[PDB]
Write a structure and sequence with these properties.
It comes from Methanopyrus kandleri. The chain is mainly alpha-helical. It has 3 domains: 63 residues, 3-Layer(aba) Sandwich (MutS, DNA mismatch repair protein, domain I); 95 residues, Helicase, Ruva Protein, domain 3; 109 residues, no CATH class. The chain is built from 12 helices and 3 strands, in the order βααββαααααααααα. A hairpin with a 2-residue loop joins β2 and β3. The termini are far apart.
Length: 267
């Protein structure tokens, strides 16, 4: 169960990937620090303050993950637990970045940090798998990362469209997309609760998680597949993409000032 990747982009792209990754680590550190304050502090209005700051770190972390490997060709032989994602992604109807494909897996980041000469000892983690507290519908948020949709990932909780969360079905309908019976059955469960964990959905339909999820590609069957099918139709918005990119670093600093104020106040 190795975690490896080779960096095949230019020297410039190397430094550029490092900086993106490191900021995503900063974002993620915040997802964790604030999960700790949630669990380590009891007050009615303190909870909503913490939830909001936490969910903002979830968005910045997803935004930075979206920006990994923008040219989709800076990494090769991306192996997560001995499985080679280069091969798998190349064989997908829509291809794409094996590095962001890896990132959406638990500890995928270990593979990318190896490519980037980022020392594993400082646990430079980035995860993008939040379910319960995720401001977006969870499988959508993972699909947006997989597709590097930095245009679509919101960078603040205020700015999350209902169509990407509680009213996720509005985003699906919008695109006249084919849905099979498995998917229809999953959607019926998520319309009930869009944040229903995937192993719950598995148990409820008598399927395995992987049959619930499917491949992160339009031509498979599962919630990952259905969302892929949708995302791949929403055209890239370079203008929004650039505002998210230039704004988010300022946001990250802002959330860190907040978090450190909340940190000294409690810890």
């Amino acid at each position: 169960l190795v975690y490896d990747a080779e960096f095949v982009g230019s020297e410039r792209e190397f430094e550029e990937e490092r900086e993106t990754f490191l900021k995503g680590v900063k974002a993620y550190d915040g997802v964790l620090a604030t999960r700790y304050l949630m669990e380590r502090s009891s007050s009615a209005k303190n909870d909503e303050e913490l939830l909001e700051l936490h969910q903002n770190f979830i968005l910045l972390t997803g935004s930075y993950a979206c920006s990994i490997d923008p040219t989709e060709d800076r990494y090769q032989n991306v192996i997560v637990r001995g499985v080679n994602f280069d091969e798998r992604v190349q064989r997908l109807s829509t291809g794409g970045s094996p590095a962001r494909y890896a990132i959406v897996y638990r500890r995928g980041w270990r593979a990318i940090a190896k490519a980037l000469d980022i020392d594993e000892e400082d646990v430079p983690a980035i995860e993008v798998r939040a379910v319960k507290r995720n401001p977006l519908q969870p499988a959508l948020y993972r699909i947006l990362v997989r597709y590097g949709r930095v245009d679509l990932m919101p960078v603040t909780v205020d700015e999350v469209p209902p169509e990407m969360a509680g009213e996720f079905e509005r985003l699906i309908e919008r695109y006249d997309v084919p849905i099979d019976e498995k998917e229809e059955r999953i959607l019926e469960i998520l319309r009930e609760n869009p944040w229903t964990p995937h192993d719950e959905i598995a148990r409820r339909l008598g399927l395995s998680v992987s049959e619930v999820e499917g491949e992160k590609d339009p031509e498979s069957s599962g919630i990952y597949s259905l969302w892929s099918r949708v995302v791949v139709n929403i055209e890239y918005d370079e203008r929004t993409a650039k505002r998210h990119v230039k704004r988010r670093d300022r946001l990250l600093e802002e959330l860190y000032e907040h978090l450190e104020e909340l940190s000294e106040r409690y810890l």
